[PDB]
Each structure stands twice: as C-alpha cells, then as structure tokens.
Ligand binder design. Structure first.
Ligand SMILES: *C(=O)N1C[C@H](NOS(=O)(=O)O)CC[C@H]1C(=O)NNC(=O)[C@@H]1CCCNC1
Length: 466
C-alpha cells in the first residue's frame, strides 16, 4: 500500500482549501525489534512515548510483522528517528491533509480520517474523484475547484459571528447562491471548528446547519403562496383583501396577524405587513393544491440532488385534499419543513425570472439549462412586491442595501424559534440570493442580510442599480 497524493481542493478562484502535504510514517517489524530490546527506550523517547507502554505494546505483538509507531512526522523529524538505525524500524512517505482556511470553510470542505479517506463534507462527497488509487504505481487524485468564493465565505463568516454576539445567539447559518448558475458562493454555520486540530470537538460545532437543520420557514414562503395566487388567474397585485380586525376564526382555530392596523390590503400590502389573515383568505380562494404545487416545483421539502453527506430533505406533505386550517397553515409556512439551502434555492428560482438552475457545490463552467417553475411574468411581479417589502414605508428598512435595490422577506421559523431573512439583489437584474438563520436570538437577521449582501455585490463587481 503506497498511498496516492489526494487531489487539491481550491475555492472558485483557485485559493487552496485542502492540501495533502508529504509526511513520514515510521512502522516496525516486531520480530526484528525483539532482537534489539536495548534500543527500544532511545526509540520511545524520540517518539515522546512512555518506555513501559512502548515496550508492553511491542512485547504483546511479538508474533506479528507490521505495527505503526508514529503517523505523519515532518520531513526532518522522521529522518532523525531512522538515523538512530534501530533494527526493524523503516520509513513510509505518506500524505497528511491541511486546511489553510480553517474554521472559515470547515463544514463545506469537511475533512479526512487517519487513512486520508473522506469523513465529512466535500472530502467525502467527492472522495472517489479526490482519492485516486494506491500502489502497481500510485495514480494521484484530481484537483476540485468548489463553487465557494473564499472572499464571500470570509465576509459571511465574520458578519454572522458578529451578529451572533450582538444578539447573544448561540448558533446560525448563512447561504449565498449565484441565482444564474446554481452555485453556492458561500455556506457558513456557527458554531464552527478548526479541522486542522481535531482533539475534543463539541459535536454541535460539527453540525452543518445550512444542510441538516430542518424548520418550518413561516413568512418566508408567503412569496410562493403569492406566486400561486398570481398564476391562478383570480388575483392581480392591486386586488384588495379585507384583513380587519387582524384575526380570522377557522371553526375552532384562530389566525392572528402580528400587525393589526389594516382593513383593505392589496397583494403587495399583505407581504409588507406579512398578514397571515390576508394570505389565508387568498389561499381559501385558490385552494392548497396550487400552493403545494408551486412549493414542490421550487424544491421546498424536495431532494436538492447535491449528493452531500448528512443533507436532510425536510417534508412538504401532499394532503391531496386540504381542509381550511391545513390550507392556511401551509400558505403562511407552518405545515412544511425545509433547510436553509432549499429556501435559498427557492429564492434563487424567484430571482432568476422563475427559472430553477440545479444547485452546485463545484465551480460551474457550463451552466445546465434551468426549468421554468414559475412563469416569467409572475416571478417578475413577486420580485417587484419583495422589493417593496424592503423599500416601502412600514417595510423591513434594516435590510436595505446601500447603493443597490434589495428584495426579501423576514420570518420566524419553528418549540424552538429561528429568526429568518431571505432575499436577492439587485432587484433590477438579480445576481445573488441569500438566506440568514439566527437561533432564538424580524429585525435580527435583516441587518446581516444588508451587510453581507453589500459586501458580496461589491466583491462580485455588480454595478449599483440605484
Ligand atoms: C412570519 O414568520 N410571521 C408573520 C408575522 N410577521 O413576520 S415578520 O416578523 O414581519 O417577518 C409574525 C411572525 C411570524 C408568525 O406568523 N409567527 N407566529 C404565528 O403567528 C404562528 C402562530 C401559530 C404558532 N406559531 C406560528
């Protein structure tokens, strides 16, 4: 077994994320060591090992011809412990993984085990491509450029970490997507870990929250309920719903708005004020089937096909016939469960004039053809409405991106609550879709969207549209 050089992983711009570095691995023929017992303690000492346990190991493996002394000394360390000239103690040239970017891309990149086999993230998902084959000569693995832009990953990392301090939040995730190419430009979770130093790792730090944390998305799916309304042929943006007095009794169940200073709202109005009553009334009119079908088409509670280890799917229940309560709770985003990634993919499809491009964690050179999941006119209309949610008076002013026109929706996700913002920018010719998730910290995640989106657009040289 002559181990193969494992393929380099870079960011989209070639910055190194996972590098296999030549290390030395001392191994021993025990049967040949049992003849030079007087050398053992010099050997043990140079391996910073206890003489008795070193000896006890060797003694008990007397009838075996292979054991590992130390795995992965530097070039000149392993050469010092072979210059002692101990009988039965030979050299192997091996490869150790180093992660130059560390904490910043830990969850995305993942890491290899003691064998240099993929254990988490991209290192596992692309193991066959990255590994090559052992020596027959050893054929080296192949280079992999990720979709991640390390400039955007660091900006996203920095800003989510800050926002978690201010709000005394213990966890969160942030996803950034290219709405045109389906590329994940940034995926960051907190807490994070350094994959270079893996002794005592709190298992909550290992959780890739963007891909495994499932939640009811709440008010962030209203734009998709609105898309279904505009495609029904029964609703235009300027049509009015009466939401007074901000409550609605469903037989026994009672729906309450957070803001109840409204009678007549147009369809834009229902999104600015985020009226559960307004969206429920529309939902009764068009039926839950139209809402289910839009949500399914944009990939909520659906397999993302990233083939990424651990990635959860959530659940979008096909009740086939919905009573009035299940109709309302689906329309304002309880009664389904989704990941941050699914929700950013859905928003990407909306931002890209209703065309869903398949998700990619790898650099996309030739973009695959999208699928038209929402008609281009409906998608253009809902973009206009979500621009008003950020821009208009009463709106989420703290999501405004100075220089650009941003579009988006806040929500509270669900037991345990997360603060959510989902949006895209620029509103005129959308480039980036973003989802922010902050655990049990409306106006928490929205300022992060603002700061990270301002940086991302400038880092991608998107001309200001305002
Ligand atoms: C959205 O997630 N909503 C709608 C509303 N305002 O949204 S926002 O803060 O402007 O983004 C209020 C918060 C949230 C919501 O609906 N929360 N709770 C509900 O009313 C449901 C009642 C049933 C149990 N929890 C959900």
């Amino acid at each position: 077994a002559i181990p193969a050089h494992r393929g380099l992983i870079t960011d989209r711009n070639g910055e190194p994320l996972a590098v296999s570095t030549p290390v030395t691995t001392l191994w021993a023929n025990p049967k040949e060591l049992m003849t030079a017992k007087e050398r053992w303690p010099q050997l043990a000492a140079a391996l910073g090992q206890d003489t008795k346990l070193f000896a006890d190991r060797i003694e008990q493996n007397a009838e075996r011809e292979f054991i590992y002394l130390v795995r992965g000394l530097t070039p000149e360390q392993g050469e010092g412990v072979i210059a002692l000239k101990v009988p039965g103690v030979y050299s192997i040239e091996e490869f150790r993984r180093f992660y130059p970017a560390g904490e910043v891309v830990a969850h995305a990149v993942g890491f290899t085990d003691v064998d240099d086999r993929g254990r988490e993230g991209i290192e596992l998902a692309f193991d066959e491509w990255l590994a090559g084959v052992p020596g027959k000569n050893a054929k080296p693995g192949k280079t992999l450029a990720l979709s991640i832009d390390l400039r955007l990953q660091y900006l996203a990392h920095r800003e989510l970490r800050n926002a978690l301090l201010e709000n005394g939040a213990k966890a969160g995730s942030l996803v950034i997507m290219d709405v045109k190419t389906g590329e994940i430009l940034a995926m960051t979770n907190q807490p994070t870990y350094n994959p270079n130093n893996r002794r005592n790792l709190q298992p909550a730090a290992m959780r890739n929250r963007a891909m495994i944390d499932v939640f009811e998305p709440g008010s962030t799916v209203k734009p998709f309920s609105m898309s279904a309304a505009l495609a029904s042929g029964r609703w235009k943006p300027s049509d009015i719903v009466d939401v007074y007095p901000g409550t609605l009794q469903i037989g026994r169940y009672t729906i309450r708005d957070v803001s109840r200073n409204s009678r007549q709202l147009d369809l834009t109005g229902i999104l600015i004020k985020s009226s559960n009553v307004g969206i429920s009334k529309i939902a009764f009119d068009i039926g839950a089937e139209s809402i289910y079908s839009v949500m399914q088409q944009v990939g909520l509670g659906q397999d993302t096909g990233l083939g990424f280890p651990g990635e959860r799917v959530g659940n979008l229940p096909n009740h086939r016939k919905w009573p009035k309560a299940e109709t309302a709770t689906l329309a304002y985003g309880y009664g389904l469960s989704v990941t941050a990634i699914q929700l950013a993919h859905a928003y990407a499809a909306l931002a890209n004039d209703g065309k869903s491009v398949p998700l990619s964690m790898t650099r996309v050179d030739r973009v695959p053809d999208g699928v038209q999941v929402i008609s281009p006119e409906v998608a253009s209309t809902v973009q206009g409405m979500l621009q008003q949610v950020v821009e208009a008076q009463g709106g989420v002013f703290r999501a405004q991106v100075p220089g650009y026109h941003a579009a988006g929706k806040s929500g509270t996700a669900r037991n345990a609550y997360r603060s959510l913002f989902a949006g895209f920018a620029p509103a005129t010719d959308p480039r980036i879709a973003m989802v922010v998730v902050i655990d049990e910290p409306g106006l928490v995640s929205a300022p992060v969207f603002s700061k990270v989106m301002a940086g991302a657009l400038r880092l991608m040289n998107v001309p200001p549209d305002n």
